[PDB]
Amino acid sequence: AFKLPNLPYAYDALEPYIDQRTMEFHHDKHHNTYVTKLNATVEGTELEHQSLADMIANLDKVPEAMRMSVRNNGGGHFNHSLFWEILSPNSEEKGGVIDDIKAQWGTLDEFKNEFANKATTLFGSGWTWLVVNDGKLEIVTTPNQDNPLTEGKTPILLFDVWEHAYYLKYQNKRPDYMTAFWNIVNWKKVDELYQAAK
Amino acid sequence: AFKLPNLPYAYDALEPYIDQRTMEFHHDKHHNTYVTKLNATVEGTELEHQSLADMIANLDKVPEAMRMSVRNNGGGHFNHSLFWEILSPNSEEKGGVIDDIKAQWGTLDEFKNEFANKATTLFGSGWTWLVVNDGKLEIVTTPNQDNPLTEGKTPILLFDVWEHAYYLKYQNKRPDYMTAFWNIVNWKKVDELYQAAK
Ligand SMILES: [Fe+3]
Ligand SMILES: [Fe+3]
Numbered sequence: 001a002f003k004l005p006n007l008p009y010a011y012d013a014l015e016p017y018i019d020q021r022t023m024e025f026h027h028d029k030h031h032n033t034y035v036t037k038l039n040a041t042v043e044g045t046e047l048e049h050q051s052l053a054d055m056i057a058n059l060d061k062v063p064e065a066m067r068m069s070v071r072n073n074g075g076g077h078f079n080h081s082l083f084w085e086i087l088s089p090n091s092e093e094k095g096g097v098i099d100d101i102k103a104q105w106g107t108l109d110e111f112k113n114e115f116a117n118k119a120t121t122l123f124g125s126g127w128t129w130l131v132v133n134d135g136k137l138e139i140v141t142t143p144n145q146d147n148p149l150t151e152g153k154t155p156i157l158l159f160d161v162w163e164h165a166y167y168l169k170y171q172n173k174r175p176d177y178m179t180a181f182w183n184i185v186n187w188k189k190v191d192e193l194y195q196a197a198k
Numbered sequence: 199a200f201k202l203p204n205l206p207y208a209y210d211a212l213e214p215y216i217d218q219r220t221m222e223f224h225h226d227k228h229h230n231t232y233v234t235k236l237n238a239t240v241e242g243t244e245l246e247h248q249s250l251a252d253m254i255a256n257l258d259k260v261p262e263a264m265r266m267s268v269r270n271n272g273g274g275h276f277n278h279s280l281f282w283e284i285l286s287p288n289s290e291e292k293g294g295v296i297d298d299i300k301a302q303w304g305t306l307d308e309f310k311n312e313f314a315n316k317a318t319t320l321f322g323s324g325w326t327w328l329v330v331n332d333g334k335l336e337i338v339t340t341p342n343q344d345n346p347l348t349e350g351k352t353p354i355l356l357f358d359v360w361e362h363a364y365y366l367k368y369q370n371k372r373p374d375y376m377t378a379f380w381n382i383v384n385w386k387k388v389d390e391l392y393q394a395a396k
Contacts (some may be wrong), residue, residue: 029370072321122269124360125322144322163323163361164370172227172362179231 001043002052004035005081013089017180019169027084031166031181034076034145041069052078075145079127087187095191097130097156104137112182115139119159120175130157130190132197154197157190199241200250202226202233210285215378217367225282228362229348232274232343239267250276255347258320273343281358286384293389294356302335302362310380313337313357318373320359328388333396354391355383 010021013080030050042048045194046054049064055062055070056078062070116143117126126143132154140148148155159181167176205225210218240246245253253260253268254276303309306393310365315337317326324341329351338346346353357379364375383384 025369033370123266124324163365167361167365168369171366172222172231 001038001046002035003034004078005084007084009089011088015185017184018087018166020022020041020167022168025050025168026165027080031076031080034073034080037069038073040068041073042044053149055145057152059150065086072145075147078147078149079145079158082158086157086186086189087184088189089184090180090185091184093185094189095187095194097191097194098117098187100194104142111139115159116175116178119161119178125162127161128159130191131155136197154193156193156197157185174184199276200233200236201280202230204362205282207285207287212285212382214367215382216285216364220366223366224358229274229278232271232278235267236271236275241262251347253352254345257348262360270343273345275305276345276347277343277356279356279366280353280356284355284387286386286387290382291382291383291385293385293392295389295392296385298392299312299335302354313371314376316377317357317359323360323363326357327353328330329353330392330395352391352395354395355388 004027007023011023011027013131014023047062047070052074056074059071069152088104088168101108101111105114115128116173118139122128122141124143126141126146128139128141129148131138131140131148133153138153140153142148159178165176170177170180202225205221209221209225212221215358240248245260245268252271253272257269259385294304299309300306303312313326313328316337320339322341324339326334326346327338327340327346329336329338329346331351336350336351340346357376360373364372368375
């Protein structure tokens with residue numbers, strides 16, 4: 001069975017960037033729902049003992065009756081799991097990954113500008129991601145709980161732009177939530193993932 | 199130019215079903231942004247005097263570089279404009295359309311049950327609709343600001359299930375927002391649209 005992870009920090013540890021109340025609803029309600037619905041699909045099946053990354057990377061091979069829930073709920077679980085771990089109260093822009101960002105984009109700010117343009121223009125619910133695609137860094141978006149693993153790309157960083165992730169504090173002002181985000185990225189985690197993927 | 203229409207009632211006229219704060223943000227910010235972006239797309243161009251309903255229904259004929267803005271922002275203007283008109287503090291379940299809903303579904307409760315099960319299971323952002331398709335009533339969903347006009351169906355009632363429409367008061371509890379909606383449907387307006395469409 002899949003389990004809801006504990007937050008690696010207090011619920012109020014990302015203030016004033018993300019409110020305590022949002023961290024509660026986002027983790028204890030929204031993420032918990034994807035996990036529960038995911039378990040209802042996979043529990044008692046072959047898929048319970050497969051890695052979630054393997055399942056999402058090969059959705060096509062999931063039985064037709066289970067596929068939508070693995071996509072949506074399995075996506076939800078994976079996506080929110082990674083998200084908590086790439087946030088940190090002690091965010092410092094440090095890691096070898098950032099040296100490589102700098103090489104491709106010219107400066108970290110030019111990278112932040114692209115990620116911002118993509119995340120503020122993503123229409124409806126979804127995520128903006130930094131990924132490795134054949135040894136190379138690229139910024140992509142997905143709708144809803146879709147995941148770049150399904151397209152052959154490894155995620156090392158992600159940003160939630162479903163409105164539940166920012167509405168209580170920021171309401172319509174997603175660009176401010178983007179600006180806030182940069183202050184809380186666990187780049188140490190981003191870089192562990194980067195070093196594993198390339 | 200496209201324009202942000204006024205609300206036909208006070209911002210607190212739909213309390214407690216839709217909260218005052220939500221009406222302030224939904225209309226003055228979200229809908230207003232749809233209008234702003236749409237106008238930035240279309241004027242100084244030969245599309246500056248084309249109606250929304252024309253462009254939405256013939257989205258395949260809008261030029262490639264303007265299509266997404268017209269789809270998304272044009273959708274958002276059409277959809278929210280209709281949404282205000284189909285809300286009312288003086289909701290009264292009466293009309294030709296209500297007689298015909300009962301004829302087709304057996305009872306009004308079964309109409310609502312179908313509409314609600316489509317509203318609550320819509321994954322991500324979008325709308326639930328009552329449409330006329332060849333003189334026949336049916337209930338459909340669209341993602342984001344997509345509109346059944348694009349598929350040649352006429353909308354006569356719609357419900358916004360983007361998280362911005364309900365997060366401040368309901369948070370994750372979409373179904374409680376759905377059940378609340380029935381108390382504020384302007385059935386008189388829905389009926390006018392119905393008699394025009396068939
Ligand atoms: Fe989320
Ligand atoms: Fe809306």
